């Protein structure tokens, strides 16, 4: 399927979501260091056999039940400093990003 | 039998330049006192400097504001040279707002209660159109030495909102200081020495007060010489033994072996406690099972064991 | 065709001078810094400029 990007990333605490907007990329001017998450990108996974364990997982948790993976770009080691710009570009036809 | 220096004939050349004279001095003490005072004054002098700022529309230091003639990075550099004098407080906030055409200087900073701007012609930005405005909030602090913005971390205990600009702090009002040694004018004494200390600050400190501060710092440092003389940490450990919900049979066995603490049990490797009477192969598994639940496997090695 | 949407992020880091950093003139003389001495230890002329 498609690799949509959004702020809502499963299995990541509210501490790492402090510096992301409604689209899923860091605010301009946020001072970053270490390995903080920069872009929230999800990669779909394949599953078509809804076993009862997966059924109860989807019942107690969200509809996806964290099936999707999280291929989110992180700050590489030894790199610090405030962000400057974000350069989102969109393919024609698809709904444009909020920013 | 040593003459005491008296701070006399202090004269001021300009708003920054200053000359302090120490009339009575002995043979070799002039250079000693001059060097000590110069090093003390250049190293550690209290002063006020801008710590962080907040401009209305900016997000970081690497941006620009429409209508101003300088980058935000440049504006921080012109602000770093701003010198203020605060009385009775240490976290004074200096808010300035200006609109129109022409340079914006420190003279238009809002008149706070007790804050004296040494020079009011210190330009910090320029405006270039009639309808643009600049609104910033400057925070000044009091310190002792050079404190870079990057080094400090305690200021990040409470999260800084995006928009708070961090600027380095110098805190040292003394920029240049030199001393000179001449012969005193006293003729009744055979030969006497006088010392004059040319001091150039940014106008934030009084030269006499600066000399007094250096002298008291030196005296307090020397106070330590006038009387020489002188001639199991983890919370999971150190817990009561009867907290692992063991069986009745293990309770008496541990008491006989005198395992009264959790950490004593974890230090026993599997080949040696089996020799204990009536330990039980299945019961031994129970002790291993409950200790594996806490993540404490048998066979660890400690170094120091306090009684408590 | 395989790419649906792209995002790029830029960082800005200020590198203050420090002992290991290399400094050179424009006459073939170079070198690495060895120590950032305080102001009060640098040699000073008669007027006191270090």
Swiss-Prot record, chain B:
Stretch forming the signal peptide: none
Region (Alpha N-terminal domain (alpha-NTD)), start-end ranges: 1-229
Recorded GO CC terms: cytoplasm; cytosol; cytosolic DNA-directed RNA polymerase complex; membrane; transcription elongation factor complex
Modifications after synthesis and translation: Acetylated on Lys-281 and Lys-282 in the presence of glucose. PatZ controls acetylation of Lys-282 but not of Lys-281. (Microbial infection) ADP-ribosylated on both alpha subunits by the phage T4 protein ModA. ADP-ribosylated on only one of the alpha subunits by the phage T4 protein Alt.
Keywords, comma-separated and alphabetical: Acetylation, ADP-ribosylation, DNA-directed RNA polymerase, Nucleotidyltransferase, Transcription, Transferase
Assigned protein family: Belongs to the RNA polymerase alpha chain family.
Subunit text: Homodimer. The RNAP catalytic core consists of 2 alpha, 1 beta, 1 beta' and 1 omega subunit. When a sigma factor is associated with the core the holoenzyme is formed, which can initiate transcription. Both the N- and C-terminus interact with different regions of transcriptional regulator CRP. The rRNA transcription and antitermination complex (rrnTAC) consists of RNAP, NusA, NusB, NusE (rpsJ), NusG, SubB, ribosomal protein S4, DNA and precursor rRNA; S4 is more flexible than other subunits.
Name the record gives this protein: DNA-directed RNA polymerase subunit alpha
Source species taxonomy: Bacteria, Pseudomonadati, Pseudomonadota, Gammaproteobacteria, Enterobacterales
From Swiss-Prot, chain C:
Protein name: DNA-directed RNA polymerase subunit beta
Summary of the function given for this chain in its UniProt record: DNA-dependent RNA polymerase (RNAP) catalyzes the transcription of DNA into RNA using the four ribonucleoside triphosphates as substrates. Resistance to the antibiotics salinamide A, salinamide B, rifampicin, streptolydigin, CBR703, myxopyronin, and lipiarmycin can result from mutations in this protein.
Post-translational modification: Acetylated on several lysine residues in the presence of glucose.
Source organism of this protein record: Escherichia coli (strain K12)
Subunit structure: The RNAP catalytic core consists of 2 alpha, 1 beta, 1 beta' and 1 omega subunit. When a sigma factor is associated with the core the holoenzyme is formed, which can initiate transcription. The rRNA transcription and antitermination complex (rrnTAC) consists of RNAP, NusA, NusB, NusE (rpsJ), NusG, SubB, ribosomal protein S4, DNA and precursor rRNA; S4 is more flexible than other subunits. In pull-down experiments interacts with CedA.
Family recorded in the similarity comment: Belongs to the RNA polymerase beta chain family.
Practical applications according to UniProt: Co-administration of salinamide and rifampicin or salinamide and myxopyronin suppresses the emergence of resistance to both antibiotics.
Source domain of life: Bacteria
Complete-protein stretch covered: 1044 to 1093 of 1342
